[PDB]
Every structure is written in structure tokens, then in C-alpha cells.
Amino acid sequence: HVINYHTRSESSIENFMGRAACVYIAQYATEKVNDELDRYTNWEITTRQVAQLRRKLEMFTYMRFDLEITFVITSSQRTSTTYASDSPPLTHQVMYVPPGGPIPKSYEDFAWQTSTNPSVFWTEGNAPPRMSIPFMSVGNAYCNFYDGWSHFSQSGVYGYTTLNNMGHLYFRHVNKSTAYPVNSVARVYFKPKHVKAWVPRAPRLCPYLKARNVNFNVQGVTESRNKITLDRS
Amino acid sequence: GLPTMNTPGSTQFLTSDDFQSPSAMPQFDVTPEIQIPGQVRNLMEIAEVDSVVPVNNTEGHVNSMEAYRIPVRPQTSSGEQVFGFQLQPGHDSVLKHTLLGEILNYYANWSGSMKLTFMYCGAAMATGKFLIAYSPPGAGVPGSRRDAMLGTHVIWDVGLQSSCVLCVPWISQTNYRYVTSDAYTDAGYITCWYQTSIVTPPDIPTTSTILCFVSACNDFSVRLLRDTPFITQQALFQ
Amino acid sequence: GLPTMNTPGSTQFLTSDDFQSPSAMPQFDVTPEIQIPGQVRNLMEIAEVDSVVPVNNTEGHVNSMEAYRIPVRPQTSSGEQVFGFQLQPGHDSVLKHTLLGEILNYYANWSGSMKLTFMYCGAAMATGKFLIAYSPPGAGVPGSRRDAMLGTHVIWDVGLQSSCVLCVPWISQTNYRYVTSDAYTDAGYITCWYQTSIVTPPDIPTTSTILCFVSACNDFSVRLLRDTPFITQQALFQ
Amino acid sequence: YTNINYYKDSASNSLNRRVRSITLGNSTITTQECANVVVGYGVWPTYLSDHEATAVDQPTQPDVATCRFYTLESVKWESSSAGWWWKFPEALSDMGLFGQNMQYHYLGRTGYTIHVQCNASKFHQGCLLVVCVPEAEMGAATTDHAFNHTKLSNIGQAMEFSAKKSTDQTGPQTAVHNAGMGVAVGNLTIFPHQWINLRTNNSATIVMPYINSVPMDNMYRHYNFTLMVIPFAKLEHSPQASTYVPITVTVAPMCAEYNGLRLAGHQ
Amino acid sequence: YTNINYYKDSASNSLNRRVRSITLGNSTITTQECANVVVGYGVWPTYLSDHEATAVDQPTQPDVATCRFYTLESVKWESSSAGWWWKFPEALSDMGLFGQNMQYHYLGRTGYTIHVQCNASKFHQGCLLVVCVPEAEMGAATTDHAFNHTKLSNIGQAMEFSAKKSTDQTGPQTAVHNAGMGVAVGNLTIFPHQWINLRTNNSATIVMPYINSVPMDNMYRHYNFTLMVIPFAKLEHSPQASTYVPITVTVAPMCAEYNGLRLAGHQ
Amino acid sequence: NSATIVMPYINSVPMDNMYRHYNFTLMVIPFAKLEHSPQASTYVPITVTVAPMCAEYNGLRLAGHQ
Amino acid sequence: YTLESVKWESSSAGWWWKFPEALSDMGLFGQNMQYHYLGRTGYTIHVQCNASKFHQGCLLVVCVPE
């Protein structure tokens, strides 16, 4: 006939979306050299910094995914004159601040000794610290594209950035001081699970420019060729 | 306690594993979902709708609307070629940036029959026929209407119908073909030749326009998920 | 959580363990298998088909086709020897590089009865008999037809049949014998002597040819898998 | 595949593996020659149910005064004409008792029916693409610069594309082959669309439901969808034929509800 | 042996622990003296089923025009003669309507029957080995150098081995005791084979099925199997006997199918 | 705009050699001549598309046709 | 099997194709004719010629045996 075969299991929504995609690379240190690479860095949660995952989500207009957040936190020793120093293992803290909560105004603030904001403590050498968050929204779907304004007067802010209040994420070294400065790097790996995606969208042609709007440069629709009719015997 | 033992592969972070995790915010009361229309459950449902192919992509027509504007005209001798491209979706730079092409590029294998649909956007008083032919890879490429009549073809009159569907059949030695096309898994050649002419009454413009859409049939399937070689960036967007 | 406790032998990589692993690419749609003919399910099915033994391996006949070409001729006095080798498959350099020999060398123990098959590739008008004898190890090796008639033997006429099968029986004190043969697990001696002659009518060439094949019987089995001492390399192939 | 659940939360789990007229109100369009009526994503426009409707105020449904055919302006199709776009419900914001209910009400939910009509002769040739795009966040012309709310959509005026690119300092990028969204214009055939082939079609009728993430939304700061009319094959005729070929858009709200009655907007 | 499966995939699991003639078409070979017919790996050549046949085009089965006995050339057996090899279907590429169907069709699936015939007298002596080797990737003579497609197989010409080694710059290593594959020539008795002992045998008949990893493959760039005739015991006679002892190969395709009809190849 | 004729095998013998005998001819004769204005399209072509139906052959030998 | 294309003019008299001589070189049909002595076949003839509403003319497509 031929009888047939080849089920579309990998063309599904969850198999296409569920892959641990890096979304932000947080950078901090122990001795403050300058800003940035100061101790105590932060990052408000958005999924539109890395172009790889951003294009995947922007083929659908409304999403309803849960999440799985994993950190790959490695540290390098800063360049100096000497390096010989015995050191205890470094403990890292990743605090999640919900929208509206109090922030640490500096290092050693008592916002790291709070009672409500969840935090993940992790020493260097073990398995990566993985945690999950549910569908954080106030509507009923994640608007990837919002064609409108923020104020009722049609003013203020154009774009999807009004409907993005996922919170923040604060990184610091728990240990008090090291004998020689150490620069750390924390990589946030989002994994969208339990995905429902509603309105399909045509995929992005020209590469992105900013992390808050859909501003672009004009590009041709495809690459060219020599002649329209190909020919040989 | 219970005596356990650690198999190799522990305290590793594979980016494509399937494990549970402790929730950060428990007992969350999520918002109830509503009946948002048009829900999509597979990536092939996007690839089964048409998208007009930029066949006339000779430079610099790709920066305008003339890339979709395959021209025909009254001839002097018949049998001439109209257009022609290779059947390499995802790699050939004609049907790479279409809607079928941008979906295969997230994958590394494809298989199934493609469907080409035409649409003659000419006058209502003009008449003519064409010979739209698919040729299996073999050897080699046809260079005449006499050569590209032995393969799979149809005959499309524009005085009877305005739209013609050409189901390109799946002929291969393998079960799948590679998207980044190499020499081993070839796919063949699509050509279109003048069957008779384009005949028109007076006071009608000569040069007309044919649109061409590409889709996927029901037996289309893709495998081996990967990331697309289209987007590039070095620093994080700010 | 559940109180566990780590037994010794954890976070180790034994190369011959049997554990599960997280898959790198999940939900893969594999290609359907077809009915490819001649499927093999065991390594002894390869070792139960014949392979002609290079008995005449005296130098430098191993660089030509004359290694398989055991010569016979009309004699002057009977009882003389034709050939002879030790029954050490996998170690003796006669039946080491045959098809049975290259399979035992991936192992460190063998057991069972071997089967030797002959094939007289002479003229159709010549006639003669031979005495193909197996001798148990004991002490020692026979040096006459009178001595190598007390052991296991058969008598093979070449005027009646062209092929003779000699099932070498398994006689040992142990259940297995070592492939890399030491003095403790001896196996014995295979010899072949002239029973009467080679008699021929005129206008026929004198020197003839006997081929010899080695196989395995049904009670053949091997144990203690290892790597072969045949291939060698130092750097990776490029 | 043991499928046991250690944790108590759902988000902590693993992955899941002729004569056919339309008489709306005191208004009648005519006709489709038994051709076709494209309806949305297969969904007819309906009212709000009770699983939805987070609001507690009672809805206002006029059903005759607001749900009739409102004929918009007429635009001119030329050979060097790139396209047009209308953003809804901004294009209907001033017409009849539909635009009057918008000023007095905070929320509003409605579906539409779009009837784009453009007639020609048998000696004209050309092909239009009539597409209804939900949530078309457009890109600015001059990047890193904010752009005005009267460049995206005036009140019922047909904003037009351009053949070249736009170097404006306060408007959107109106390159027609990028369709204002940075996307290939050939791939806009996902959205509910219909062609107008001038040799066979003569019209296009699209019926769009209410597509939004919230059940009811304010209609004075959010463009629900835009309507793009892009010619793919350009209009061509002899110089003796009739040169003025216009395009009229006639649109009608379907199943319009409102909530939150207060004084007139839209400050 | 608890035999529990933690993961959802199958590849993530653990290990699994006279007168007998043959009348094909308008062609008849004769005979085997009630001797033997070796058939493949125990498998008779059949057609394609529906679990197979990934192609959608309808197959072309001529059944008479292409499936008859095609008599190849005749080679000369001498005393200092090493061997021969024919690569299929390159050896049948020009014969009759079988080689004409190959030019017009992209794919092709076929089995064969090989009848190697070589007669002598009772006063001749010698022994041939007729073996059919699937997928015999041969090694080049001059290593690190590519080698030509007309050194592996000409169209129906019997490529011959050599007693010594080959120092060619563009051909394969034709040392006959290595059999062109770097393998001991005594161990080629895995493949479907039959001996020709000149005192009792006089012929050899092998019936090979289609052995390939894909159900249908292009037959103009892939050698399915080669046929090697190697004498192990050399031909010897008196100088008064007949010195010219030839070897004729007669081969016939069985159950040949084709797909992908296009113009003539093979570019 | 077209014409479709389906002809059977018409011959006095059941099977005949097809390299020395013309079975039938196909004649296209215009009875009313082609006329148009000089501004219309002047090139009006005629294409013939033919297909054998139920073809049988006998007497397999080497290639003809001497 | 699509044959050649001919040009219809005002001063054009007619054409004739003799079968199976007109199909003697096309595809695997003309290849089976060379290797076979006898041959029996029927055909289907599709003569196609399009024009406009402003052209006028009339063709006669006739299949003449023997």
C-alpha cells in the first residue's frame, strides 16, 4: 500500500518545548572589583534574553507552561600575585523575590535572613540545585505578544513588557570572605513543562535587537540564487 | 538504613532528562483556564497549512514583493521552461524560509509527501496549459519538456481551474531523508514547462503572475530535534 | 527522607555492569526493522560452518595459495605419513587463523568435539586409501602407521567417496580445556598415513591435492570472554 | 515508567508523556456567489459563559444598535500600492452606538465579521491577501526610540505600508515584505485569511471570534487584532480600461458585551 | 532480577538477558545430475511486501522480459590463474531488457540465480570455489589513494585476481589469498558457496536473495554482491589432453522490481 | 478546447509486427481557419498527448530492426 | 507521452502522425518494440489547443486505420 508508520511523537508541543534552555548568565564575585562583577547581582525574570528559547515561544501567542529552574554555578579564581590559600567550600544562595516584595539594598542586609522569600543554599561540588515554580500569572495565559499600551490614554509603554511581573532572582556568596577573590558565574536553565500553547504564529525571520520590544531591521525574505530556471541534461 | 549503591551517571545534569523536583511555592491556586480558540497540539499542524514560496528569488528581488511573482507571458515557440527548483526543504534557498522550511530546521530528519499548490493570478480571459513535473533523483536533471514528461507530471489548464495541486510522492531508498541535504539522500527536481502557450484577447497586459504554495500531507513526520541554524547572537540582549 | 546507606562499590565504573541510564534523546521514533535474511543469534553458529585449514604452511607457502594444498603422490613403500598437526585450536599455528580459531581467541576456555572434513581434489581415475587417526594425549606422539592404528581412526577410500568426516571425540579429565594451551590440558595429535597407495592409469599427473576443513559439532561451547591477541595498535586510527 | 509521585504539588511533577446575503440588524450585504465564508479558528463568535466572567456587574448586550454592518472608508488600489492595515476596535471607535458604548464601559468583549469587497472587470488582473492577525506587536521604524499611538492606528483611517523601508522617527517599520512584525510576509497564511483573485473571487468574508488571554478586556488601550490587505499580484490593466479600482471594507461587531458602567472615557 | 523499569524509553533499558532443468522465461539450462541447488541464506527470492516498500509509486514487474537466463562471457582456466570476480548488478547492466529498465528507474530490488559451468574430462584435476559475497568493500592497491570505478567492475567484464600482490596506483589490492578484503581466503566459506570438484561436480548453482539494509536501493551506485570464482586446487593435465578449459557464467535475475520512473540515467 | 479519442487495436491479425506496419494515422485538419485581430496573441500551438493502453509483446529476441 | 507542439496559422493545411511510429522512441514503450517481434496495443489520443474568446476556428481530429 504501503502501511505506515512514523508516529509524530517528537513533533509534539512538550517534546519541542521541554529542553533545559539557558536564559541568563548571572555574574558576581567575592571582592568587589567594579560594577559589574560586584558581589550581590540580580536579574528580573524574563525569558527573552537568549534568542534560542525566545524564538521557540514566539511561534505561539499564548502559553500556559509550568517551569523547572536549574542552576549551573561554577567559580574561577581571580588573577592576582599569589594563589596559595586553603579555603573552605563556597556556599551559594539564590533568593527568589516575588513581585512587590522587599529587596536586599546591599550585601549583608537582613533581606537574606527573611522568612517568606524562598532561597536555595548549595555548596560547590554537589549536584545542581533544581526547583520548580507553578504557572505564575494573573490572567489565564502567558501573553508572548500584547499589542497595546499600559495606560488607558494610549500612552506610556508599548509592548509585552507590561504583562511581565515574574519577580526577581538574587545571587550572593554566603561565606563571609575569602583570602583571595573568586568570581562566580550562575547560569539559569529554564525547562517549560506541562505546556499548553494556543494561537500559532509565523516564525521570526530577522534576528532580535533588544530584550523589551520587537524592533527589527529590514531583511530580505530569503537568500538569492542565480537564475529562476535550473538547467542541465 | 537501606543499603544503596551509586550507579555511574549520578550528580550529573543532562539537559534532556525527565525527573521531578521540589516545588518552590507550594499550594498555589492557579487561575482557571478558559476556552481560548485555536489550540495547537503538534508542530506538524503548523506545517500542514500553505505558505507562498519565493521562487523568483533572483537578486535583488528578495527585498521586495517581486520574490513571489513567477512571470509568464505569450511565447514564440512552446515547450519552454517557466521555473524550476530542487526538492530540498530546509536546505535549498527557495523553500527554506517558508513555513514548512522553518519547522524542519528544528529537526534533522524528514519523511513524507509534500503538496505544491499553484494559483494563476492573471486575467479572466486568458487561456493556457502548463506541465508541472516532479522527477526522481537518479540521473540527472531534465533539460527539456520531452525529458520531463517521463517522470511524475500533471497538466494544468488556467482556463478551467485557477488552482492546481501536485502531491509530490515519496520515493526513496531510506525511511527518512536528512534535512541538511547531503549527496546520499537526494530528493529530485521540480520543474514546470509550457504545454501550449498563454493566449489572450486584445487589450490585456502580457506578463502575468503565478503564486506557488508549499505544504505537508498527512504522512509527513520529522525526527531528531535540534536547534535552528538561522538565529545568531553573542551577548545577551539588553 | 528515606534513610539509606552507601554500600562499598558506589561511584565506580565497572565496564561489565548491567544498569539503566537516562536517555539523551527521548520519544525517538525508530525505523521499522525489515526481514533482512540470514540473521545470526550466537557466535557458535559462525563456528559451525567449515573453513579450509592451511596445513601446508611451511615457509614461504603462506604468502600464496599453496598453503591449502596438501600433496599426495604414488609411493614406493606404503605406510608413510601424509601430514600431521597438534589438536590445539586457537594456539597451534595451523588451525589458529581458521574460522573456528578466530572465535576461540575471543575466549579463554573451549570444550566439545571438533569435526574434520577432507576433500580429495584429484583425477577421477585415481584410487587409494588413507588412515586418518586421532590419538589421545597420554604419551606420546605416534611415529608409525603401526602406532597410529591403536587410537581412534577411520579408513577413507578416494575411489568410493571424495569427502570424509572425522568427528574428533572429546576425551579429557577436565570439563573445559584452555585455549592458550598449557601442559596440563593437553589435547592430542591428528595424523594421516598412507593405507595402501595412490594408483593411477597412464597420462595423469602424479602430485594431487587434498583440502581439509575444520568445524565444530553440536556439543561445542566456549567460556570466559576476553580480547584477542591478534590485533595491535598504539595511536588512534586517523 | 513506574509513574509514582513523591511530591504533593502538580507543578512538581514530571513531563506529560447569487442570493446568499447576510442580514445583520437593519443592514444587508450582497453577496457571495455561493463561494465561501471563512470563520475564525473554526469557532463561531459567542457570548460569555459562567465558567468565565470574572466580573460581577451585569453585562450590557444591545444586539441591534451595535451589531449591524458598519461600512468603513474606501481606499484606492494602484500598481505601486503596497498594502493597508486597520487595527480593531480602534477602527470602529467612532461609528454609531458601538463607539458610544465603548466610552461608558470599562471592559468589552466582541467578535467581528469582515467583508472586504473590491470589484473589477474580466480585463483586470491582480490578487489581494486579506488576513486578520491577532496581537500584531509592530516594530518601530527608528529602533531604540518610542513611537506614537497615532502612527499605529488613527480612528478608522487606513494606515498603509510602503514598498521601500521607513526611516521615520516616531512611527512603525512599514516595510511590506516584513509585514511590520519582522516576519516573512509569505508566512502570514496561518491567521484566518482569504484571497481575492480578480479573475474569480470579487470578495472576501472573514468571521473572527474573540481571541484574548483574559475573558473581558478594556478596548481603549489594547488592539485585539489588525486587518491587513496586501496585494501579492499587482493591479494591471490597459490604459483604456477604468483606472480607478477602489477597495471598501465593511465590518460588523458580533455578540458584543460590556461591563463596568462609569462616566465617559478615555483618560 | 527485580526487572523494574524506571525510565519511559526503550533505549534506556538494561541489557536483554540427468533431466533436472530450469526453465526461466524462454531459456533453459541443463542440467544438475540430481546433485544440489544452494539457495542463499535459506531464503528464496520474493517480492516486496507492504510492511516494507517505503516508496509510493507503483512497482514495475516485467516477469518474462527481464527474468530469463543471461549468459555472460567465457574465461580461460589455466594453471597459473588466480581467480575472477564479477560485481552485480554491474555485470548485468547492459544485457537485454534488464539493463534497459535500470536506466529509466531510480530504485531497484532483485534476486539472482548463478549457474557457473565448467566441464572437463576424467583425466583433468582441479577444484574451484564459487562464492557470492555481499557488500565486499575492497581495499585499494596503493593505500591513501583513491581508486577508479572501472577498476572495481567494468560492464560485464571479468576482473581477475593475481598470484602476487598489486602495486597499482588506481586499482584494488588483488592479492588472491587476501581476497581483496584483507581477509583470509580460506574463511570465505560463510557466504553462499559451492565447490566445483572436476572429478565429481561439473557445475554450481547458487540462488541469492536481495540482501540489503534498505528495502529498495539505487542499482547504479551500489554493488549489492560480488561473485568470486577462486581455484583452490589448480588445473593439471597431461600435455596431450585438451588444454583449453573454459568457464562460463550464466546468471538470471529473479523477482525484479523497479520504482521512480524518470528519464534515462545515470548522471 | 480539446478532443479525446480512445482507439482499440484494429487489425486483421491478432498480433502484428510494429516496425513495418502503420496501424493507424492521426490527422488534424482545420476546416475553419484560425482568424483573430492583429492585436491578439498570434501564436496558437497544438500539442498532442498520446498514451498506449493494454500493450502486449511476443517473440523476445535481440534488438531490431534490420 | 506528450509529443511535439505544432503551430496553427491561417495558411496551415493540416498534419498527420502515423502510429506506432510516432511513439517509437519515447520511454520504455519504444524500448520494448526493439526487443520484441510482435506487438498489440491500443491508444488514447488527447489533442489540446487552447485559445481565447476572440479567436475563431475549427479543427477536425480524426483517427484513420490503414
Task: Report the 10 Å Cβ neighbour count for C35.
Answer: 12
Place of cell 479543427: G59
Grid coordinates standing for B176? Answer: 527518512
Give yes or no for a contact between D77 and D248, defined as CB atoms under 8 angstroms apart.
Answer: no
Q: What is the largest CA-CA distance in chain E?
A: 80
- By Cβ distance, the residue of B4, B176, B223 closest to C6 is B4
**Nearest residue to C212 (alpha-carbon basis) of C101, C52, C99, C97:** C52
What's phi and psi for C229, nearest 5 deg?
Answer: -90, 50
Place of cell 487489425: F11
Grid coordinates standing for B58? Answer: 533572483
Grid coordinates standing for F17? Answer: 509486427
B104 to B177, B221, B222, C155: CA distances (angstroms): 11, 10, 7, 72
Give yes or no for a contact between D22 and D28, defined as CB atoms under 8 angstroms apart.
Answer: yes
Cα B148 to Cα G27: distance, rounded to the nearest angstrom:
11
What are E160's strand-pairing partners? Answer: E84
Residue C146 C-alpha, separation from nearest chain E C-alpha, in angstroms: 31
Grid coordinates standing for A57? Answer: 515561544
Grid coordinates standing for E30? Answer: 541443463
Q: What is the DSSP letter of C66?
A: G
Question: Are E189 and C68 a contacting pair at CB < 8 A?
Answer: no
Amino acid (one-letter) located at E220: Y
Which residues in C lie closer than 8 A to residue E14 (C-beta atoms)?
Answer: 18-20
**At CB < 8 Å, which residues of chain F contact B?**
1, 37, 39-41, 43-47, 49
Question: Are C27 and A5 a contacting pair at CB < 8 A?
Answer: no
Place of cell 506557488: B212
Q: Is A151 helix (H, G, I), strand (E, B) or coil?
A: coil
Give yes or no for a contact between D125 and D265, defined as CB atoms under 8 angstroms apart.
Answer: no
Q: Which residues contact A103 (CB under 8 A, 6 or more apart)?
A: A42, A97, A111, A168, A170
Give the rounded distance of the alpha carbon of C204 from its chain centre.
33
Q: What is the DSSP letter of G54?
A: S
Cα C184 to Cα C178: distance, rounded to the nearest angstrom:
9
Q: Which residues contact B151 (CB under 8 A, 6 or more apart)?
A: B133, B134, B135, B136, B142, E261, E262, E263
Cα C88 to Cα C90: distance, rounded to the nearest angstrom:
6
Give yes or no for a contact between B102 and A200, defined as CB atoms under 8 angstroms apart.
Answer: no
Cα D48 to Cα C84: distance, rounded to the nearest angstrom:
100
First to last CA, chain A: 33
Per DSSP bridges, beta strands C152-157 and C109-111 are unpaired
Give yes or no for a contact between G48 and G58, defined as CB atoms under 8 angstroms apart.
Answer: no
B210 to B149, B166, C80, D194: CA distances (angstroms): 21, 15, 94, 17
Give yes or no for a contact between C189 and C139, defined as CB atoms under 8 angstroms apart.
Answer: no
Judging contact as 3 or more Cβ pairs under 8 Å, the answer for B and A is yes
User: How is C2-42 classified by DSSP, letter by letter?
Assistant: --EEE-SS-S---TT-------SS-S--PPPP---S-----
What are E162's strand-pairing partners? Answer: E175
Question: Are A216 and D173 a contacting pair at CB < 8 A?
Answer: yes
Q: Is E126 helix (H, G, I), strand (E, B) or coil?
A: strand
**Nearest residue to F45 (alpha-carbon basis) of F31, F36, F34, F53:** F34
Cα A181 to Cα A165: distance, rounded to the nearest angstrom:
34
Cα E228 to Cα E160: distance, rounded to the nearest angstrom:
9
Give the rounded distance of the alpha carbon of C194 from its chain centre.
24
Q: Which residues contact F41 (CB under 8 A, 6 or more apart)?
A: B74, B197, B198, B199, B200, G52
Amino acid (one-letter) located at D191: F
Q: What is the DSSP letter of A89?
A: P
Question: How many CA atoms within 13 Å lie on the side-chain side of B92?
Answer: 20
Grid coordinates standing for D46? Answer: 459567542
Cα D93 to Cα D253: distance, rounded to the nearest angstrom:
11
Q: What is the DSSP letter of G26?
A: S
Q: Is G7 helix (H, G, I), strand (E, B) or coil?
A: strand
Which residues in E lie closer than 8 A to residue G32 (C-beta atoms)?
Answer: 65, 97
Q: What is the DSSP letter of E267?
A: -
**Nearest residue to A58 (alpha-carbon basis) of A130, A187, A145:** A145
Grid coordinates standing for D156? Answer: 478608522
Give yes or no for a contact between C27 and A9, defined as CB atoms under 8 angstroms apart.
Answer: yes
Q: What does the buried/exposed string (b/e) look like for E174-206 if buried means 16 or more CB atoms within 10 Å of the residue's CB?
A: bbbbbbbbeebbbbbbebbbbbbbbbbbbbbbb
Sign of the dihedral through C-alpha A210, A211, A213, A214: positive
Amino acid (one-letter) located at E208: M
Q: Is E54 helix (H, G, I), strand (E, B) or coil?
A: coil
Per DSSP bridges, beta strands A130-133 and A67-77 are antiparallel
**Cα angle C79-C82-C84, degrees, rounded to a multiple of 5:** 115
Residue E36 C-alpha, separation from nearest chain B C-alpha, in angstroms: 35
Cα A6 to Cα B112: distance, rounded to the nearest angstrom:
10
Question: Are B5 and C5 a contacting pair at CB < 8 A?
Answer: no
User: How is chain B classified by DSSP, letter by letter?
Assistant: -EEE---SS-S---TT------BSS-S--PPPP---S--B-BSTTTTTS-EE-----BTTGGGSSGGG-EEE---SSSS-EEEEEE--TTTSTTSSSSTTHHHHTT-SEEES-EEEEEEE-S-SS-EEEEEEEEE-SSS----STTGGGSSEEEEEETTT-S--EEEE----SSS-B-SS--SSS---EEEEEEEEEEE--SSS-S-EEEEEEEEE-TT-EEES----SS---SSPP-
Give the rounded distance of the alpha carbon of D180 from its chain centre.
15
Q: Is A142 helix (H, G, I), strand (E, B) or coil?
A: strand
- Integer-rounded Cα Rg, in Å, for chain D is 21
- By Cβ distance, the residue of D12, D15, D221 closest to A151 is D221
Q: What is the DSSP letter of A57?
A: H
Cα A89 to Cα A73: distance, rounded to the nearest angstrom:
13
Q: Is E152 helix (H, G, I), strand (E, B) or coil?
A: helix
**Cα angle B17-B23-B25, degrees, rounded to a multiple of 5:** 150
What are G15's strand-pairing partners? Answer: F28
Question: Are E9 and C23 a contacting pair at CB < 8 A?
Answer: yes
Place of cell 535500470: E102
Cα B96 to Cα B103: distance, rounded to the nearest angstrom:
9
Grid coordinates standing for G65? Answer: 486505420
Q: State the burial class of residue A98 (Cβ atoms within 10 Å of its Cβ: 0-12, 13-18, 19+).
A: middle
Which residues in D lie closer than 8 A to residue A201 (C-beta atoms)?
Answer: 190
Give yes or no for a contact between E72 and E156, defined as CB atoms under 8 angstroms apart.
Answer: yes
Give yes or no for a contact between F29 and G58, defined as CB atoms under 8 angstroms apart.
Answer: no
Interface with C, mutate which of E1, E7, E44, E125 (most C CBs under 10 A): E125
Q: Which residue of E has its CA nearest to D16?
A: E8
Q: Which residue of C has its CA nearest to E83?
A: C65
Grid coordinates standing for E56? Answer: 509510493
Task: Report the 10 Å Cβ neighbour count for E12.
Answer: 16
**Nearest residue to C158 (alpha-carbon basis) of C217, C84, C70, C99:** C70
Cα D213 to Cα A148: distance, rounded to the nearest angstrom:
13
Cis amide leading into E89 (omega within 30) = yes
Which residues in D lie closer than 8 A to residue E4 (C-beta atoms)?
Answer: 2
G44 to B130, F7, F50: CA distances (angstroms): 20, 6, 6
**Cα angle A175-A181-A187, degrees, rounded to a multiple of 5:** 70
Cα A72 to Cα A171: distance, rounded to the nearest angstrom:
13
What are F2's strand-pairing partners? Answer: G48
Cα C64 to Cα B76: distance, rounded to the nearest angstrom:
72
Cα E211 to Cα E228: distance, rounded to the nearest angstrom:
17
Question: Are E55 and B139 a contacting pair at CB < 8 A?
Answer: no
Provide the total of helices (H) and of strands (E) in chain A, helices listed first. Answer: 2, 10
Per DSSP bridges, beta strands C4-6 and B2-4 are parallel
**Nearest residue to C195 (alpha-carbon basis) of C137, C149, C228, C234:** C149
Question: How many CA atoms within 13 Å lie on the side-chain side of G21?
Answer: 11
Name the residue range of residue A196's domain.
1-233
Cα B53 to Cα B69: distance, rounded to the nearest angstrom:
10
Give yes or no for a contact between E249 and E86, defined as CB atoms under 8 angstroms apart.
Answer: yes
Place of cell 503572475: B209
Q: State the burial class of residue C36 (Cβ atoms within 10 Å of its Cβ: 0-12, 13-18, 19+).
A: middle
Q: What is the DSSP letter of A10?
A: T
- By Cβ distance, the residue of A13, A24, A126 closest to B236 is A24
Q: Three-state SS across chain D?
A: CCCCCCCCCCCCCCCCCCCEEEECCCCEEEEECCCCCEECCCCCCCCCCCCCCCCCCCCCCCCCCCCCCEEEEEEEECCCCCCEEEEECCCCCCCHHHHHHHHCEEEEEEEEEEEEECCCCCCCEEEEEEEEEECCCCCECCCCCCCCHHHHCCCCCCEECECCCCCCCCCECCECCCCCCCECHHHCCCCCEEEEECCCCCEEEEEECCCCCCCCECCCCECCEEEEEEEEEEEECCCCCCCCEEEEEEEEEEEEEEEEECCCCCC
**Nearest residue to E242 (alpha-carbon basis) of E82, E121, E80:** E121
Grid coordinates standing for A61? Answer: 501567542
**Nearest residue to C203 (alpha-carbon basis) of E231, E125, E201, E232:** E125
Task: Report the 10 Å Cβ neighbour count for D43.
Answer: 17
Give yes or no for a contact between D189 and B51, defined as CB atoms under 8 angstroms apart.
Answer: yes
Place of cell 544485457: E95
Q: State the burial class of residue B237 (Cβ atoms within 10 Å of its Cβ: 0-12, 13-18, 19+).
A: middle
- By Cβ distance, the residue of G36, G41, G55 closest to F58 is G36
Cα G22 to Cα F49: distance, rounded to the nearest angstrom:
11
Element at C131 (helix H, strand E):
strand C127-135
Give yes or no for a contact between F51 and G1, defined as CB atoms under 8 angstroms apart.
Answer: yes
Cα F38 to Cα C89: distance, rounded to the nearest angstrom:
97
Sign of the dihedral through C-alpha B88, B90, B91, B96: positive
Cα B69 to Cα D234: distance, rounded to the nearest angstrom:
9
Cα C200 to Cα B53: distance, rounded to the nearest angstrom:
85
Q: Which residues contact B160 (CB under 8 A, 6 or more apart)?
A: none
> Which resolution in angstroms does this entry have?
3.4
Cα D233 to Cα B123: distance, rounded to the nearest angstrom:
11
Q: Which residues contact C155 (CB under 8 A, 6 or more apart)?
A: C129, C130, C131, C195
Task: Look at chain B and count its residues.
Answer: 238
Q: Is F11 helix (H, G, I), strand (E, B) or coil?
A: coil
Cα E117 to Cα D130: distance, rounded to the nearest angstrom:
76
Cα B86 to Cα B140: distance, rounded to the nearest angstrom:
12
Give yes or no for a contact between E111 and E98, defined as CB atoms under 8 angstroms apart.
Answer: no
Amino acid (one-letter) located at B32: P
Sequence-ordered strand ranges (E) for chain E: 20-23, 28-32, 38-39, 70-77, 84-88, 105-117, 125-134, 159-160, 193-197, 203-208, 225-236, 245-261
Q: How many domains, chain A?
A: 1
Cis amide leading into E31 (omega within 30) = yes
**Cα angle A132-A135-A137, degrees, rounded to a multiple of 5:** 135
Task: Report the 10 Å Cβ neighbour count for A97.
Answer: 22
**What residues 7-36 of chain A have any CB closer than 8 A to a CB of chain B?**
7-8, 10-13, 15-16, 19-20, 24-25
